[PDB]
Ligand binder design. Structure first.
Ligand SMILES: Cc1cc2nc3c(=O)[nH]c(=O)nc-3n(C[C@H](O)[C@H](O)[C@H](O)COP(=O)(O)O)c2cc1C
Ligand SMILES: CCOC(=O)c1nn(C)c(Cc2ccc(C(F)(F)F)nc2)c1C
Ligand SMILES: CCCCCCCCCCCC[N+](C)(C)[O-]
Ligand SMILES: O=c1cc(C(O)O)[nH]c(=O)[nH]1
Length: 368
């Protein structure tokens, strides 16, 4: 498709002259007017994957934080992705921290951000998602595409369980899966990663979803089933904390763990020396991949893993898969590679699996 080529003409210009968050706003604006390219290709049946009975037509989606409000789901999915995680959303809208709060380092292909859960609130985002689902009833390019919702707490909230229960009762019907975000470094959130607190949070979320069904058509999503429950983990933990959390995740029978969110322990990027927030991009890959391996070993391979962190090429994706991941999420790749992220990474992964001696992608999950 020549449209990806035409777009890459402006990528370096964007990185050099346009503020990052403004670049992101431009991205969403172009997609709102249905001007982004379309991935016209066909996905390899040998590259599909799944988490429980949630089936992904390909192993690549957009991570949370990119379309925080679901204003652009169709166009982002039609770039070539199989799923998108909208959010993180909160019961009421928040403006976030003061701008600029996103900083890029092109040399290291890394980003640091302190957004602060800026979003339009659960009500407006629920409206946007209902409209998308109506369009999806007709759009054949969007058939079988998955939409997940990441939910969080408002800054000035003490009871996280309240905020998450409001969101579930509002938008749960419309989501294929729900991602619990207790790993953002820019809001008392990583405190909720304490084993006991986390176990209560998870079991509460999973009860509010089950309660949606007890009160009797219902599931207005892609799967026609109740949404699965994922947990997004921060990588800034010691082995003891990782073992305890893995026990909690197994005890609550969550459906998947997203490894991982941004990290605050990177300090070989001189450009970010004076900045605060979580770091993402190529500098997070090795940290993120190792974290997958640990949790893959700690949970006895019983919890599917959604990989997130420094995935730019099919080789990185295969690293994640061969570490224990079943599906991959992109974010920084879209920042530094433009619209072609999905098409290019699908092409490369397909070639890799065909050459490395794999009948299909699911055969590569695990394999150390
Ligand atoms: C500007 C920005 C905003 C983000 N917002 C969220 C968010 O709201 N919720 C969330 O779970 N992760 C959020 N993330 C983390 C990403 O979803 C992803 O986990 C992380 O960037 C690592 O992936 P990557 O290396 O491909 O960028 C955000 C990341 C960035 C850079
Ligand atoms: C949250 C962090 O987002 C960013 O900082 C960011 N930076 N760039 C260059 C991009 C990709 C991009 C955006 C817009 C355009 C276009 F306007 F040319 F179309 N091309 C590429 C993003 C996203
Ligand atoms: C439309 C028949 C099913 C009724 C209940 C769910 C409706 C939600 C429609 C979302 C789009 C789903 N799909 C499979 C058509 O792409
Ligand atoms: O989960 C999150 C949230 C934010 C933010 O909104 O600031 N940033 C991240 O890096 N991860």
């Amino acid at each position: 498709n020549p449209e990806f080529f035409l777009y890459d003409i402006f990528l370096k210009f964007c990185l050099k002259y346009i503020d990052g968050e403004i670049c992101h706003d431009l991205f969403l604006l172009l997609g709102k007017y249905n001007i982004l390219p379309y991935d016209t290709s066909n996905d390899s049946i040998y590259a599909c994957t799944n988490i429980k009975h949630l089936d992904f037509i390909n192993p690549f989606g957009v991570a949370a934080g990119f379309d925080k409000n679901g204003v652009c789901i169709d166009s982002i999915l039609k770039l070539g992705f199989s799923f998108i995680e909208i959010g993180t959303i909160t019961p009421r809208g928040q403006t976030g921290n003061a701008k600029p709060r996103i900083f890029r380092d092109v040399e290291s292909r890394s980003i640091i951000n302190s957004c602060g859960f800026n979003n339009m609130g659960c009500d407006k985002v629920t409206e946007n998602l209902i409209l998308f689902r109506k369009r999806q009833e007709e759009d054949k390019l969007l058939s079988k595409h998955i939409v997940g919702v990441s939910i969080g707490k408002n800054k000035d909230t003490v009871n996280i369980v309240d905020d998450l229960k409001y969101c579930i009762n509002k938008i749960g019907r419309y989501a294929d899966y729900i991602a619990i975000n207790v790993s953002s470094p820019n809001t008392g959130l990583r405190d909720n990663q304490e084993a006991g607190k986390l176990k209560n949070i998870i079991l509460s979320v999973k009860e509010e979803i089950d309660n949606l069904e007890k009160n009797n058509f219902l599931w207005f999503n892609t799967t026609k089933k109740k949404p699965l429950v994922f947990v997004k983990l921060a990588p800034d933990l010691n082995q003891e904390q990782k073992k305890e959390i893995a026990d909690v995740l197994l005890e609550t029978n969550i459906d998947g763990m997203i490894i991982s969110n941004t990290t605050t322990q990177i300090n070989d990027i001189k450009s970010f020396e004076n900045k605060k927030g979580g770091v993402s991009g190529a500098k997070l890959k090795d940290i993120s991949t190792k974290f997958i391996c640990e949790m893959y070993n700690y949970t006895n391979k019983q919890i599917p893993i959604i990989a997130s962190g420094g995935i730019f090429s099919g080789l990185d994706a295969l690293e994640k898969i061969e570490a224990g991941a079943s599906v991959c999420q992109l974010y920084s790749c879209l920042v530094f590679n433009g619209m072609k992220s999905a098409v290019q990474i699908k092409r490369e992964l397909n070639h890799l699996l065909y050459q490395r001696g794999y009948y299909n992608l699911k055969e590569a999950i695990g394999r150390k």
